Structure 1
């Protein structure tokens, strides 16, 4: 149970605008989330997520999200990205942020009068996967491997970020990465914990594009997707 928090995702704005009772509830399931991180089709969730609870498709803008960039950054700029995991839904696993560098695909997700098809959502996923923002692109950022994976397996990569293991120190799972206080960010079910990293933005410019957050659960056959509207100029 989780969603992207910084920069403010469509999921965050959705909650803050009164529309989304459970921002953390945008789940893709059932899927094989593990150990092949990119195998599972995104179906209806797409790169921005679909919230079954409130029946919100975030892949399309409304009056409350997706109208314009929430934040503007510079090409190649190193930025803070944060997601929020629920106290009762810390599934461990691995997460990544991506930018699709094909504007004609992303445009289909910036029009309030158009809902992208399942075909377009998958095309975008594929584009986003080409535009993954590796942990290791930020100099000085320590990029560990998953305690729930072994060398050679499809999950054994450190372009993606990893949560801590379950049986780990006294900093387990995704909460353990920041080891922040409860309610360091908002979730509706049991209160939230921040999970904070850095990414380096591409030398790719847009007045309006997306960062798509993807969390592949270890504990569960579930994926969590959010997107944030940004500019790189």
Structure 2
């Protein structure tokens, strides 16, 4: 259980607006999340997430999210990106951030009067996959391989970030990455822990585009997706 925290995602805003009772619950399942991290169709979840608890589809704006950029950046800027993991749902695994560099695709996710179809959500997901922001694009960032992967498998890739080993004696799992205090970020179930990295934004301008967060489990078949509205100017 988790969701994107910085920049503030649609899911974070849905919870802060008093709409989403369990932001960390928005999940794509059942799916094959491992070891091939991008083969599973994203279905209704799409690149922004769907929360079944309250029937909230984050792929379209409402009065509470999606209307404008939450934060503005510069092309090529190295930025802080953070997600929030629940204390009781820390799965380990691998996660990433993506930006679709096709504005006309993204526009269909910026219209409060339009709900993307599942085919449009998948075409968008494919554009996000193409627009993955690699861990390794940030000078000096350590980009390791997963303790839950072996070379030759489709999870053996350090463009994606990895959580710490599930079985590590010190600082295991995703919480171990920052080793932050409980409730350093909000979750509804048991309180949240931050998971913080940097990415290099693309050399691309938009007054309003999306960054999509994706987190895949290894032990169970589950994917968590969120997106944030940003500007790159």
Range of TM-score over shorter length: over 0.9
What's the CA shift for 1:150? Answer: 0.4
Q: Take 1:144 and 1:179, find their aligned partners in 2: how far apart are those partners?
A: 17
Cα distance, 1:197 vs structure 2: 0.2
DSSP 3-state at the match of 1:27: coil
- Give 3-state SS (helix, strand or coil) of 2:136's partner: helix
Shift of 1:169: 3.4
- Deviation of 1:219 (Å): 2.2
Over 4 Å off, 4+ runs = none
Secondary structure of 1:104's match?
helix
> Aligned-pair RMSD on alpha carbons?
0.5
SS at match of 1:28: coil
| 1:13 partner SS | helix
| TM-score when normalising by structure 1 | 0.99
- Alignment match, 1:168: 168
Size of the aligned set, in residue pairs, is 233
Deviations 1:73-117, CA, capped at 9 Å, x for gaps? 000000000000000001110000000000000000000000000
Tell me how far apart the structure 2 counterparts of residues 186 and 89 of structure 1 sit (CA, whole Å): 13
Shift of 1:200: 0.1
Partners of 1:76 and 1:152 lie apart in 2 by 32
TM-score, structure 2 normalization = 0.99
Equivalents in 2 of 1:169, 1:207: separation in Å? 45
Counterparts of 1:29 and 1:206, CA distance in 2: 32
In structure 2, distance between residues paired with 1:232 and 1:101:
11
CA shift digits 1:32-59 (9 cap, x unpaired): 0000000100000000000001110000
Deviations 1:5-39 (A, max 9, x none): 00000000000001000000100000000000001
